[PDB]
Write a protein that binds this ligand. Structure first.
Ligand SMILES: CC(=O)N[C@H]1[C@@H](O[C@H]2[C@@H](O)[C@@H](CO)O[C@@H](O)[C@@H]2O[C@@H]2O[C@@H](C)[C@@H](O)[C@@H](O)[C@@H]2O)O[C@H](CO)[C@H](O)[C@@H]1O
Ligand SMILES: [Ca+2]
Ligand SMILES: [Mg+2]
Ligand SMILES: [Mg+2]
Lengths: 285, 286
């Protein structure tokens, strides 16, 4: 079994096309996460709206009629509600407004599309989102920057959330399931990127995008209960810390105090060591 | 040795962050190319301005003073002329004007940056490009759409070219070398993507980006003269055509005239390494 032999700082976020700047852990008020992008099992199963390629990450495609944008997949093929909470690659950043850069095949210009994901018109699961002034036409959009949510008024930016893909929060939208810290002092490890906008926004994801393409290619025929990893400094070969990767597609470690993986340098490489028990006890970082 | 076990249609261009829509060949007035992005050898050596990740492809970073933008690497670290023709990831699309979307850490808004790559102020090899009205500040920019070059005046979009990175065409800028078709009668295979802008623009590259990160991770210890590949339909296992991958990081096939060839092939296939063969191994026409 392998993970990419590439330093983290050379890789991308899987929730937006941004370089990885650090690893991190969630705030204490966040336990589980339910990201829809950046979801891939260790045997190569893409989950949620996750694409193989970063060229599809945090993008939209659709036709505006001036009132709504009727969404398709990125290549123009139809999207249907049975397929997921939104088309493949659709942004999954909750807790913020989006500003999406819209361009067109065969036309000049770009247009900023401002997206509040809270109103009842934002129903990407049913293939429809408000146009909010975007004129009639077919567009491809990519997430460019974010800002605080328009509703509730005065809300903070909380990128540990996902948007409401349905007409209400009680509508079933085929979300990929939540990911939980597995217990016994283990914390979920996140890969972070700086996101432009009017604040110091840091976007967490569960796996770098290049890990997703690697795993989806590798299609490991063997996956055990948990993969013991070392985070290694490439030049010296020094083991900087033990981590576990779990079959559902996430990494953990046991921090040695509040001052964790966030302290580790970001130019290391995760290396598979061996398959271990689900309850294998890690050495604190 | 391995290439990604992923269909081409799931992958990205390596010269802009765009899905692959087809394979193609160059026009018959283009033999060689000198792309600076999308360059990786079979043993994992990144060449030119090529980055490991698509998150760095066709991007810029720098500080405007209102007149010039002084460039850095994407992460803010200094760029110096000895390092290359431009910072890693810098766009390499010749034969067009660029329209770059500029954003800022800590500020609202985006700004369009219009780039004519022909004037003597466009000197990314020396770390400086004209601001063209972009106000003072630090920005990250990504290529968004393209249009015909502003100069010379009435010329067509030509994405087989690279820009002039230096003060003049005679300045040495440490370009990655040109790639030529090798023989006989093998053609260079290009991976194409649709690029937004006021025309039917198709952007060629030599390798999907995910091949680059794969090869850079793999660091193959035993590369031979040429890799014999099959382009396989995953479901049926049918070999749709024999191809060769060459050490310098490009693929070829022999089209059966103009009835079979890269453009006629479905884009949902997977390239599979078969074996190492001699440089002069003759392929069966596609
Ligand atoms: C943003 C724009 O689409 N740029 C391309 C476009 O520019 C020309 C047209 O927009 C035209 C419409 O009447 O007006 C011209 O002013 C404009 O020229 C561009 O901007 C001026 C200020 C000068 O800097 C010109 O050198 C520059 O081209 O079309 C041109 C080709 O005509 C280019 O593709 C521009 O990128
Ligand atoms: Ca909503
Ligand atoms: Mg790694
Ligand atoms: Mg392939």
């Amino acid at each position: 079994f392998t993970l990419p032999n590439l330093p983290l700082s050379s890789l991308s976020n899987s929730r937006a096309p941004l370089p990885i700047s650090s690893m991190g852990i969630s705030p204490d008020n966040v336990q589980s996460v339910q990201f829809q992008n950046g979801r891939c099992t260790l045997d190569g199963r893409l989950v949620g709206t996750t694409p193989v390629s970063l060229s599809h990450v945090a993008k939209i495609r659709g036709t505006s009629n001036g009132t709504v944008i009727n969404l398709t997949e990125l290549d123009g093929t139809p999207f249907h509600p049975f397929e997921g909470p939104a088309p493949i690659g659709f942004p999954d950043l909750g807790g913020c407004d989006w500003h999406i850069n819209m361009t067109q095949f065969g036309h000049s210009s770009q247009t900023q599309y401002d997206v509040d994901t809270t109103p009842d018109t934002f129903v990407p699961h049913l293939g429809s989102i408000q146009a909010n002034g975007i004129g009639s036409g077919n567009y491809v959009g990519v997430l460019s920057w974010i800002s605080p949510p328009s509703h509730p008024s005065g809300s903070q930016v909380d990128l540990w959330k996902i948007p409401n893909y349905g007409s209400s929060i009680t509508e079933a939208t085929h979300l990929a399931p939540s990911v939980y810290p597995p217990g016994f002092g283990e914390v979920l490890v996140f890969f972070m990127s700086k996101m432009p906008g009017p604040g110091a926004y840091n976007l967490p994801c569960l796996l770098p995008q290049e890990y997703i393409s690697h795993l989806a290619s590798e299609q490991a025929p063997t996956v055990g209960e948990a993969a013991l990893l070392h985070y290694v400094d490439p030049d010296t070969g020094r083991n900087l810390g033990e981590f576990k990767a779990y079959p559902d597609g996430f990494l953990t470690c046991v921090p040695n105090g509040a001052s964790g993986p966030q302290q580790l340098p970001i130019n290391g490489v995760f290396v598979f060591v061996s398959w271990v028990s689900r309850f294998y006890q890690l050495k604190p970082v």
